[PDB]
Design a protein around this ligand. Structure first.
Ligand SMILES: *CC(=O)[C@H](Cc1ccccc1)NS(=O)(=O)c1ccc(C)cc1
Ligand SMILES: *CC(=O)[C@H](Cc1ccccc1)NS(=O)(=O)c1ccc(C)cc1
Lengths: 33, 247
């Protein structure tokens, strides 16, 4: 049942990527400030 | 910076080491690592369709479509680069990896963007493609970046992926290679990076079954000790050599 692992990992990767993007903007903003 | 040599799906050591790095750098990691990891259901993210060149597109239109495809893949902020790119692999095998990218649809960083740039611009022979690498200095550190230089109908441009909007794609509107390069340097000035070195590669052949490696550094020039009048010359001689299919 190997595809299902991809599809789930893709969904976790994009989930996580959302958060690190939002993190990196707060870091860069508070940098500037 | 870790890279995945396990392919897809990702094996357990490299998967856990991703959540490793993610929980340290995040001030509130672990609280959120669990929420993704342990969640019965997540939304299945949209799969962007890979663009195909249609006769109603200009070259600038196709170039924006490639760049928009990469932007939808998103820049990889996870800390774990998902597709291994061995720079000196034959072009043939790097193209295989680009196929992986479009068929697995995952975030990417700048190097992988360049490979996929090449893979999507094979098949339009009016476009020539060559990598531009930058070594830059900021706050006691050196950094390395790469983009796909583009040459078509007497105009230069680029494709790329960056965390910064001014260090990727550049429209097909620069009249010299130097104007392209000098735009990047001014863009880096916004982020207080000093450009120390610039490496220009060779045109990447349009044979997708070539087994030669990409040439990454036919021209290397130490822009730090040089004045713009002489950067331009050195860059202008080399661009013209590229066009006269000497180099
Ligand atoms: C704070 C900073 O470095 C940015 C740099 C920048 C980059 C690209 C184009 C313009 C400027 N300056 S800023 O974007 O104007 C800025 C952002 C956030 C704050 C709090 C101040 C300034
Ligand atoms: C090509 C790559 O991985 C870079 C990493 C890097 C490069 C320069 C400075 C910091 C990090 N791509 S990038 O993260 O998009 C990038 C970030 C910041 C700048 C100022 C340029 C490029």
């Amino acid at each position: 049942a190997q595809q299902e692992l991809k599809q789930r990992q893709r969904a976790e990767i994009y989930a996580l990527n959302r958060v690190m993007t939002e993190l990196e903007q707060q870091q860069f903003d508070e940098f500037c400030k | 910076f870790h890279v995945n040599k396990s392919g897809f799906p990702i094996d357990s050591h490299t998967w856990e080491r991703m959540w490793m790095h993610v929980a340290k750098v995040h001030p509130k990691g672990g609280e959120m690592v669990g929420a993704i990891r342990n969640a019965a259901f997540l939304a299945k993210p949209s799969i962007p369709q890979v663009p195909n060149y249609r006769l109603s597109m200009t070259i600038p239109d196709w170039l924006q479509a490639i760049q928009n495809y990469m932007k939808t893949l998103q820049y990889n902020h996870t800390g774990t680069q998902f597709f291994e790119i061995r720079k000196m692999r034959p072009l043939s095998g790097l193209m295989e990896t680009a196929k992986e990218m479009t068929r697995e649809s995952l975030p990417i960083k700048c190097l992988e963007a360049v490979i996929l740039g090449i893979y999507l611009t094979n098949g339009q022979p009016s476009i020539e493609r060559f990598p531009i690498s930058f070594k830059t200095y900021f706050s006691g550190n050196y950094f390395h970046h790469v983009v796909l230089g583009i040459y078509c109908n007497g105009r230069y441009g680029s494709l790329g992926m960056s965390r910064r909007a001014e260090l990727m794609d550049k429209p097909l509107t620069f009249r010299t290679l130097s104007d392209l390069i000098f735009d990047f340097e001014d863009s880096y000035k916004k982020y207080l990076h000093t450009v120390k070195k610039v490496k220009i590669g060779l045109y990447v052949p349009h044979e997708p079954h070539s087994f030669q490696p990409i040439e990454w550094k036919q021209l290397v020039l130490n822009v730090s000790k040089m004045l713009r009048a002489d950067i331009r010359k050195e860059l202008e001689k080399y661009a013209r050599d590229m066009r006269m299919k000497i180099l």
